[PDB]
A and B are shown apart, each in its own frame.
Chain A
Amino acid sequence: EVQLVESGGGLVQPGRSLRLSCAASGFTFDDYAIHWVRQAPGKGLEWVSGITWNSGTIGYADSVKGRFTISRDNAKNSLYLQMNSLRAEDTALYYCAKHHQIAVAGDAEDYYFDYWGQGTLVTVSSASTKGPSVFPLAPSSKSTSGGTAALGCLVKDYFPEPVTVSWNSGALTSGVHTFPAVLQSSGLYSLSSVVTVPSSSLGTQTYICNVNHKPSNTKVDKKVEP
Chain B
Amino acid sequence: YELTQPPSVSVAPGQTARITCGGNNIGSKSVHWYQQKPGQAPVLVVYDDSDRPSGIPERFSGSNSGNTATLTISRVEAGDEADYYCQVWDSRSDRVVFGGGTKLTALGQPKAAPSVTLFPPSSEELQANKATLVCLISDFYPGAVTVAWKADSSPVKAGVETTTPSKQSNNKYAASSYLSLTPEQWKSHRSYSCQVTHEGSTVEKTVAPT
Contact = CB atoms under 8 A, between A and B. Distances in A.
Interface in B153-194: 160, 162, 164, 167, 169, 174-176, 178
Nearest to A186: B160
B203 interface: no
A150 B120 CA distance: 12
Interface string B77-91: 000000001010101
A87 B94 CA distance: 24
Q: Which of A95, A150, A182, A184 has most chain B Cβ within 10 Å?
A: A182
A182 B136 contact: no
Interface string B126-165: 0000101010101100000000000000000000101010
Interface residues of B, number: 47
Secondary structure at the A interface, as helix, strand, loop or mixed, is loop
Contacts, number: 108
B53 to A, nearest CB: 7
Majority-rule SS of B interface residues: loop
A140 B122 CA distance: 10
A136 B123 contact: yes
Interface in A199-226: 225
Contact of A137 (B41, B99, B119): B119
B122 A137 contact: yes
Assign chain A's interface to a size class: 35 or more
A194 B89 CA distance: 44
7 contacts: A44-B100, A100-B44, A111-B89, A116-B43, A133-B130, A140-B207, A154-B122
